[PDB]
């Protein structure tokens, strides 16, 4: 029986340090992606994390993470930089977006969904000339 209890003490201290490890991972989960949005790829929630929710369990702790789950992906065209031919230094780049050659010319789209909308100053910012960018002359963006 004393040898069995030495084995018990050994496995209990193993479970103790394992619970300690689970404690810093627990605070990492609850403080990074639960009370904020993690900037890490699939850190606690798969895909683009939106929100997370946490609830106690009699020996542990329970985590749902509601996240953006894309579907029905289609094939489109995107550009690299909208720059004037007369003024190559005048370039624009999207603020975390994309250029889409819409029907109805390149316009802004969010970087996660089929959400096309006309190019404004509120989603782009001026950048440097490059040889790999593109010219437009028939309709310069505002």
């Amino acid at each position: 029986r004393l040898t069995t209890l030495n084995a018990f003490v050994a496995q209990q201290l193993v479970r103790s340090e394992s619970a300690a490890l689970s404690a810093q991972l627990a605070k990492d989960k609850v403080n990074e992606c639960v009370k904020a949005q993690s900037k890490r790829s699939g850190f606690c929630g798969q895909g683009t994390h939106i929100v997370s929710f946490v609830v106690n369990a009699p020996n542990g702790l329970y985590f749902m993470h509601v996240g953006y789950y894309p579907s029905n992906h289609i094939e489109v065209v995107s550009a690299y930089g909208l720059c004037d031919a007369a003024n190559p230094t005048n370039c624009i780049a999207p603020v975390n977006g994309y250029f889409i050659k819409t029907n109805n010319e390149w316009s802004y789209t969010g970087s996660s969904f089929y959400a096309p909308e006309p190019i404004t100053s509120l989603n782009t910012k001026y950048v440097a000339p490059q040889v790999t960018y593109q010219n437009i002359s028939t309709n310069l963006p505002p």
Binding site: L5, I50, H65, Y69, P70, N72, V76, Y114
Partner: protein, 226 residues
Amino acid sequence: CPKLEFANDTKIASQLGNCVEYSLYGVSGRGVFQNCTAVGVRQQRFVYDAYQNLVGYYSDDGNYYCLRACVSVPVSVIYDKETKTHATLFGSVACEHISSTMSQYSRSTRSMYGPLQTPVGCVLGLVNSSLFVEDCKLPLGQSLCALPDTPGEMRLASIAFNHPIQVDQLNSSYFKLSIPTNFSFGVTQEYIQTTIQKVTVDCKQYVCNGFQKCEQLLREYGQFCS
């Protein structure tokens, strides 16, 4: 050695390349013959491994023969609950042995299902089917799986590769892109073990469990439980 009516049908050349119970007048065991090139001192006659087991042998006439081991077929099993379905697997082996000579306890078979060549070996109890399952719950190893019928039969399948949506690239200023057009809000769900049920114990309610004598005996052990 003791005397014996010396059987002629016991020679080394009789079952060369075959598994036999070797008994070299004290060197006892069971292994497989093979013909090799002579290595080591021929007067020693016995060549051993790093783990005190014979590898080679200098024959009396002078034909050097190796005996490594009589390796046998590794056997595994599959059984599914709530569908009375079960089959046997044999690792890295051609379908070479039939029900004649096993060992241990009584093997059980069903109606003939038969021996099929898999890359992992030989299988009994499967029907061939070029199927593909991406999310197999009980795989068969390498990239193999079987799925039971909803008197059912598990049927063969390879572990399918999840093909990503193939999008090409353009070497011009124009660039090729791909975009989600619908979505959902998937819930990633998991759990951790934070704090287990903590427990203590008495010395004398676990070990003496109330024994007087036990008491006086444990006093020499003393401070161990403390």
